[PDB]
């Protein structure tokens, strides 16, 4: 069956994410904000079959993300610069997607979403060679 990724989520793991946006560009002030706006985020999933909602809210930012499996969409990389998605399934559990910049050149970026078995969230973010990786639980 379809993984259901639907539910509140809650963070429970997190590595590499300041360096990320420190290999990113991402200026120290601002990595500094995206930490501490990133350490206990509110996630909220609702998925319908390949249509998925995603809000995740944190004191200075709220990001809604509106996709279909299969169908291009436009969002902003996790650095900000704005790019065309496109989401597919790798396995009957976990989702990729490959982002391409509308504007100019830039390092490969890309996400994964993973629903295990044991009902975990993972989630990863990649610049090039560079990894965060984020485990949630739902609520």
């Given at each position: ?23 990113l ?26 249509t ?24 902003q ?43 975990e ?6 610049a ?6 984020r485990?949630y639980?739902?609520?």
């Amino acid at each position: 069956h379809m993984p259901n990724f639907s539910g509140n989520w809650k963070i429970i793991r997190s590595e590499n994410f300041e360096e990320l946006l420190k290999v990113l560009g991402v200026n120290v002030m601002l990595r500094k904000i995206a930490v501490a706006a990133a350490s206990k985020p509110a996630v909220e999933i609702k998925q319908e079959g390949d249509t998925f909602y995603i809000k995740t809210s944190t004191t200075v930012r709220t990001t809604e993300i509106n996709f279909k499996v299969g169908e291009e969409f436009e969002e902003q990389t996790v650095d900000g610069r704005p790019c065309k998605s496109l989401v597919k399934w790798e396995s009957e559990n976990k989702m990729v997607c490959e982002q391409k910049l509308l504007k100019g050149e830039g390092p490969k970026t890309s996400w994964t979403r993973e629903l295990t078995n044991d009902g975990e969230l993972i989630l990863t973010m990649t610049a090039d060679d560079v990894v965060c990786t984020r485990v949630y639980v739902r609520e």
